[model samples]
Target: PVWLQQKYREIIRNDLPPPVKHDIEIKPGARLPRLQPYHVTEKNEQEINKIVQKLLDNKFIVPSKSPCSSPVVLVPKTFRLCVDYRTLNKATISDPFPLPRIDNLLSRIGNAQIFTTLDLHSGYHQIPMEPKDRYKTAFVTPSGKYEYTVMPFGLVNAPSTFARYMADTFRDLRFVNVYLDDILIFSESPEEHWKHLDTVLERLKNENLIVKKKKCKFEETEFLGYSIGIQKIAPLQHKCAAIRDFPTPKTVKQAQRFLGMINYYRRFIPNCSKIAQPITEKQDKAIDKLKDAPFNNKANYRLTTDASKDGIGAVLEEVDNKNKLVGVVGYFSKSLEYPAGELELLGIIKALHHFRYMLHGKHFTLRTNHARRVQRWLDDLATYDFTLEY
Candidate 1:
């Protein structure tokens, strides 16, 4: 344990150097211009100010009078500050750098019993901004105008630039894989692991690179959506949980999110593109809820219902079971020019009638997609005597 802590401290670098120069090319005949700053909430203003203060304190940004200005966006999950660079990115030419082949990395990591994942701290910021292109990253806040002195998120070629840097840094090393900001070092035994980790850390230190201690993992950790270990690698638990608890997507947008997660691990799954083709083309409507329904009946009776412009669909299933399609118990289609509220209510009534044989005496959970429709449905059924509960 002491050796681990000592090795960790030796590898952690709280301070980072300025990023190396990365070139960005603007189209030869393009006469692109800057855009106005978008508005922000008071809460958003506070977050912007807080993050800006840190950037300023660390000399990662400086006051700028560039005509270019983008709004500061606050990411909800982590409350992280980001600049919207769509306008700037559009004006710039794309930099197509070949990313390191993941297949190569997997092959190199093959059969390594031990692994250590090293994540860079504010990885993008560690790279210094191109002096001539710094103005392109300008952002406006309620506090003042500023531009990044270091590479910031939201740039189109940021990933390409970073990937290039990583590939060059570790091109000669074996048993070490680099994916942008994350580094993975693997070995077959503890003796080999220590030497490999030390060599990688020492190399990073020589390059003035630093890693986040909180994120730097030793022995076993999630790497590229897989939990790797001495035995074998498997998909990360949280990723699996997301696929497990994914609600029946209510719209095409929601379906895209679900499919995107699956696509990330496409290499591990067979016929990924073939499987996703059906969902990708018809992204305008949510698919049937029973598309992947379970087979177990004794789990719990759960009902999912949705009403769209085309028609209404509902699925009844047993919860807490393998993701297997149980059966399509019923289907109801009626041409009603009623409002959305009434259409949904009618669909629910029809679904209940069709499954009345199985649901008559059993208590079940009902989850409806349309908020207004379900609320009104509950109100309409309040005065009637129904065995089913909302």
Candidate 2:
């Protein structure tokens, strides 16, 4: 569309962003150490010259005469440069800005049938350093000493600072979700999507924040590592490939990393803890696989619940013409501490929520112990159709 092309030309640019100061507070009475430049290979030293020039043109860095300086290291197997701000980061007080919960964002975007992903170009560098604290951001190359005018990567509070900035920018806007450098604009219709995109771009232009045109996607795109779809979102294939191609561990660290990697998509895989038990104990076990059926609105529903001292467990079964349960629709659990009868009541209440979509406005059998003791909670459950049994 012409409108799309126009907005891209106007808003998506690779320009030096305006200086917006960010404070980096050092911890009280912490020593400010001046670190020397880390040793880089001859190839890396040549690459540093190009990086310095790029950083200079963007006004991200400049020559410095600071008492404190951090060192830069070449990325292993890559020519990219990074400042090792370990000591400075340690001395700096953490800026505690709350990031949005992933689960909350997923559910919020679950209903949107269309999506556009906007990528910020060199986002961290858009954050300018505080004048008083600029000295702390100083770095040394083999040839020269320089300090950042903008926020450099490798600082601990970089994400926290950028998160706050993003939240403030898109706080009042609907259908615009910002998680650091990732911006997801979602809508229901093409016209609405264009309007939403225009509004988002206008804000970016006004704020002097530019998007990376190469990375931008429209009308169904990936955002935050998940490929978006109509009533669907899933982990990117690369992540899945990493999990699929993971080799058997020969050491404890490898085992720990394997567990860590799978934990990212843990929600999709059920009984993760159960299946990983052997792996956690330094062995291998096959994963649990199950066949499931969609909830049939016409079928009878069965909810079996049990309450323990520590937690409550529930399972949903769909009863088809075959007599025995056709399939285990789903299962859920909640951790709570209460007496036996009270815990049983809590299990019913909590499990009711988990199966509400399937069991709503329909008759179902709730099989759980201590049925008589549920009268107190029954008043609230009157709207629900269910036959309580022991």
Candidate 3:
């Protein structure tokens, strides 16, 4: 661990190299015309410019006159932004490259001690978009039309393309495991950890892959929503809190959302389908039992959150001396495609925003299943004057 710590400079990247361009196989004779730009307020226009300027400066995009275009949407998590690509995705052919199944990925973690997680900085943007297909990604703004030179988020085939890139890059290494741009290097001993870290870093350096230093975790880390340690891996504490505290669904959409959140952990819950049937049938009795607020109203207010592939959910409760339920406020799922760290963090932030009326002055407890990746988010919340309990 000391050697790994000392060589941080060598392991971390400052600037990324030129994108490694690759070909995209699209359906023959495909051409998409530009759609009209979406209207934005003066404030939104300014926000869009900041993102556009950075992409332009980095040569990640160029002015284009392509027929295809999409509008930009602001993500609730701060100033993060994304393009609406539903139309473009429909015109493009899907990539058949398979992602590693969750079961198989978990199986590889057997008997591993030391773990290090490295997340690529702006992961998709690191890969250059196909030359011929670049025009198909054009989007309109108040400034004009632009197209991504690097892979943009929301492409139907982006994940498969990234999976292929990861597979080919790490084909020769035994200890390095990758899912899209999230790389995990594991070893059973300190001696072995050093060698594995060296191998992984050397590969990344050779490929000019830039990883965000702040997001990377060396010893104790969270990867793919699960906390990792020397002895075992389990759902993050906050994650369980959100699941345990989730409320009874009131609509078909809400039921589906709750089912989706728990489905990720189906292996641990036997006959998961049977367990989830009550929500679909609107059987309040079973849901009421599942939705108990674990504690009562005399203590500090507690909030817990969890994120899944498509949406995020949270549960807030007030507890009393006997640790019985008193009052509760639960936020159902908000659909968005977000990074695990940001998703979990946003779940808490949105819950606070919703209940700021009662929560502003009081110190409260916040919970999440994410291990250390959550600290960076907590740092952002520091100025808000609240105590965080991991």
Candidate 4:
């Protein structure tokens, strides 16, 4: 009777019988390939200083009253400077730092035409460190401990300081905008553009604040979400360089990293699931293959997924004939427990929602590994409740 119980358990467990013998193709260790470095120091320090001073000489410095508040952001232009706020966020500051809403800021700009973006040259460095606050700003470098001589961009309080400055500097200047380090001088015409430009430069000069002249671009320059034109407007270029020419992954971990990046920009590509379904199903196989050995030639592999939570979502980024990330769509992750169909639909829904404000009349295609589901949704929209009318 005990033997019968064991036999039943074995039957349930061993759906696929184990191989009697093994052909182990053991190989050598895998050599991790090097990726392109993101940072390249430009030895244009002298020129950079000149640009900074020029801006400062023009009084372009926008000083924030609060050292802990994010500036209200109007619709953006082609410049962005994000501060590394990792340290002060964890510091023991008693004050609260609240994020500002873009909606409220957008209403204030009203209507403007031409735009120019002026990014401060190493913006955080322009701020003078207080004598007593040196210890708070000390950083560990290879050489040794050194407190920041000027404001470091990698601090938590910089945004509030910068924003507060902008709010104060441009407070009454209609149509002028500043978000963090990006300053947008908006004007109605060529004459107005010149006036706004001079005012911005003057603003920087008055406070000894500096900005990089090379990075500054005149009207129609691209930045953030909104594109500034002499008379037109559009969204900024979508970021997708992370996976554009991603190398073939050798290890499961490498695959996961690439997959994560793909998942991140899946909105810019379409039919991601169908294109990536083959890869998601190889997760377990990749683990098993690693048990034996590593080889270079046959290393390119895919991850596997049987269900939504266990599987990876896919999107195929389509570049135009000119090789630009024009649009994206595909299955994306919703949750750990989300079902397959639900995950697919969630990806589409999120993609649609993200571009709702930006898409307008742009003709973009939506592709899915499961085309039937997409078709069904389209049919539902047309007949069920007419959701596509918008």
Candidate 5:
């Protein structure tokens, strides 16, 4: 033991001298000792050996290039996959990115039996890139340049293209579903599940594509946070987080983006325009004034007059004795006819008409700063059969 301790000290002192000699030290847990020959055991190496043996046994060599003229390369599951789209991401003209279509995506899950999810590993990069366009999508590494001959992820139009390919591939196959990158193979029974999985596997083999084994989940035991078995499931909660506060925009661009998100969920909010007025006022003001305002530079840019995230809101409180129930607010509306007008009146009309019954016989009053305009508009529009009413 004493001799071995001395030998260890010699190795650390002579080789790893600075750390051992100096007061500075490297954490023992952080430093990994070099592996011995026996460390590369058969169990760890089996998958690699199997793939290599299969390729070699088949006498399959990488073509002087791929025969089909597609840059097809079979990478083992053991190989780490990454999409290199540096050139395409750089040279390609950028466009507006669409927000996630939550409603449309959620609607696709109609009552289905067993849901088998298929997560394609490197789905976008699975398709080969065009040879001429390969350089455009080439990737950089510290070692050298490498262009993806195959398809890669994070590229625009990728989700749509992949969805179309899957749809075309399984057009004849019934009950096999594809949702963008998610392929759900459904089955009413165990036999059907087996059949679906087998067919999908066969299709992948034929197409020279691969599915990630680790990510596949068979017969998802739950749906939308509720357990679903022989019986239908109900949603757990009414998604109350919809009413939470959002960031108030300081810039015009930020305001526009916020408005877009709010409009997307406008149905959830009772009076979006009335509440939205705090930010909407900026639209009519001079751009220079908005950009140059001294208050805009501060952490609290909301003006107190606005009663917004950036400002405070106030109204003349004239308590009425006769109508104790109704506070004498000058500019108020219990109806959809908001005091502040909207760009597309038809859009707001359509939205309100979708829930018209809540409006009928409602003893709510509408007050506008321009009260006469509201009266004239209602008087003129009352007789028209536009299918919307105040």
Candidate 6:
């Protein structure tokens, strides 16, 4: 315990991270954007001035004389100073990294007995901007025009750049999963968890990265957005409440808005596409099935495939040790131009492709109707690992 305390104290400090300079590539021959300040309330101006002063004192930002300038604005509720770099970001050449997917993160944390989340102190501010590109990040605040020596939050590629850093830090770490500024460690036992934490802390310290104490939970059940338990993961209860409280839509725009919200969190809901088809075309607002449903990676997967004259449908289910149906992991439906009679075989093919993430390499039973007339079709699916019952 004392060792953990010592290590915790060492890593959890409010200090600037190392100067890992990140480059912001601008499109060739693009006009340098020089937008003036929009409007800042007197109170917000003083707040921005204070923040500018703090960054100046810390040397994160310095006075600039670049042709480009972005206006700074105060974020409502939170007075965090943010830059409007819309035009600048558009002119910049994009370099992107695949962000951690919800599916991947859930899979990674499923087998763990214990988990700890470590939030990087000052997240994006830790990485320094490339010397030459710092001019592009220049922003006009109430105090004066300044450029960030370190990467700032408003830049579009800031996330992609930071993702690379986080991914690079935890490479080859079996029990470690990172999402941007958060580093998650999960292990089979309490002892293993601590050892993983130790290695993670040692790496962060070695890399000159500091962890903030506020988000450093010792053994929290929640990992960033979702909560994981005995055998499954679910979006937070409060978040579910937010979705449930939504009012029904009476117009196309309102329906579009509702679908937008639904599609965003569709990963947890089974038959989501089929369920939302009515709303997308025309609203029961009957989306409560997603509320408590959680995806369990450790459970045995069973896929049910069917094909109608109009479309093919697939449902992925998880079965617990007791052989009882746990829940549907997900659902997929797609329009296919084919006769309903021959669709049985095509059902397996399309469903297999849709559920490949869950069923690939792993042996899973496919429950379907007879499809033997298409024996040639069976040979094509040899690469897959599912056995069908036709």
Q: Highest TM-score: which candidate?
A: 6
Which tens-of-lDDT digit does each residue in 1-390 have in candidate 5?
Answer: 233234322221211111001011223343212211122235434543454344334332221221111111224565533333332344344344243243322323334567666666535645655555444333322222344444555554555456566766775665565555556565667666666766776676566555564555664543332333322332223322331344446787877766665454343333344555555556434222222210001111110011123212222122233322322111111222232342123233332343232223233222221166555545543532322212
The runs of at least 3 residues in candidate 1 whose Cα sits more than 4 Å from the true structure, single-residue gaps closed, are 1-11, 15-19, 249-260, 263-390
Candidate 6, residues 1-390: lDDT per residue as tens digits?
A: 558777657668766534367887878888778888878788878888888888888888889888889888777675677788888989888887888776676666655777777889988887878888889888887668999888888787888888888888787897888888877787778887778888988888887788887766774467667776645666677667777787667778877877687665666665556655565323454544443343434567778887665557788887777554877666776654545546766877777876666667677777887645466566656777766665
lDDT of 1 by residue, 59-146 (tens): 9999988877777777788478788878777888998788877534554564577788899887887888778888878888777789
Comparing 1 with 5 on TM-score, the higher-scoring candidate is 1
Predicted structure 1, TM vs. truth: 0.64
Query: Which residue pairs of candidate 2 clash?
Result: none
Candidate 6 residue 217 C-alpha distance from true site, Å: 1.3
- Candidate 4 per-residue lDDT, tens place, 1-390, comes to 233234333222211221011011112342211122123125333333343344334333222222232211112253332322343344433222443344333333334666677776555555665544444433321212233445555454556666676667777776666766677767667777776676766676666566665566754666445454443433344533333445667777777775565554443333343444434457545423322211011111111112345433533233454433533222233333335666655544544443333222234344453567677655542322112201
The lDDT, on a scale of 0 to 1, for candidate 5 is 0.39
Clashes of each: 5, 0, 15, 45, 12, 0
Q: Report lDDT (CA) for all predictions.
A: 0.67, 0.74, 0.68, 0.44, 0.39, 0.74
RMSD of each: 16.5, 6.5, 17.6, 25.1, 21.7, 3.8
Per-residue error for 170 in candidate 2, Å, reads 0.8
RMSD to the native, candidate 5? 21.7
- Runs in model 3 deviating more than 4 A are 1-11, 14-19, 24-26, 66-68, 130-133, 270-277, 280-285, 288-390
